[PDB]
Design a binder for this molecule. Structure first.
Ligand SMILES: CC(=O)N[C@H]1[C@H](O[C@H]2[C@@H](O)[C@@H](CO)O[C@@H](O[C@H]3[C@H](O)[C@@H](O)[C@H](O)O[C@@H]3CO)[C@@H]2O)O[C@H](CO)[C@@H](O)[C@@H]1O
Ligand SMILES: [Ca+2]
Length: 128
């Protein structure tokens, strides 16, 4: 049930997991929790999410708590600033070090506690 989009396959999970357990699942399937690197991809993901919440590859890295992509795509603070839900990231409770797609909109992302369970999206490149 992997969905194809611009050179990548995506797995929208049917079972919810914590952020890290999700990532481990993706890694077991030769993939990673999805990065988002274009408006086109953001649109594909939130539309396919159909109004439900899915973990994506967003997580904090380094001392400063800068956001990063688990698949090692460099995180672009400028190009991504538009992809957060208004008021996010807010580090609510000072325990929100992972990110998910939450709203069906270009402003889709929320930071939430990594230990919360949600559905999740894996991304795997097509390699011919
Ligand atoms: C953990 C998390 O996702 N926190 C984000 C926070 O989500 C909370 C928000 O959606 C409110 C809406 O009222 O609901 C919270 O869940 C509650 C259920 O709605 C309620 O039925 C149940 O009994 O209790 C739940 C816990 O109170 C939900 O966690 O939303 C903010 C933005 O507003 C984010 O910044 C947080 O990351
Ligand atoms: Ca938040």
């Amino acid at each position: 049930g992997w969905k194809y989009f611009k050179g990548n396959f995506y797995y929208f999970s049917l079972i919810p997991k914590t952020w890290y357990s999700a990532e481990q699942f993706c890694v077991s399937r030769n993939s990673h929790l999805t990065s988002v690197t274009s408006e086109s991809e953001q649109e594909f993901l939130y539309k396919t999410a159909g109004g439900l919440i899915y973990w994506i590859g967003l997580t904090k890295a380094g001392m400063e708590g800068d956001w990063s992509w688990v698949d090692d795509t460099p995180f672009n603070k400028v190009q991504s600033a538009r992809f957060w839900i208004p008021g996010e990231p807010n580090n609510a409770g000072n325990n929100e070090h992972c990110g998910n797609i939450k709203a069906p909109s270009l402003q889709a992302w929320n930071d939430a506690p990594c230990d919360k369970t949600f559905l999740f999206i894996c991304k795997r490149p097509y390699v011919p």
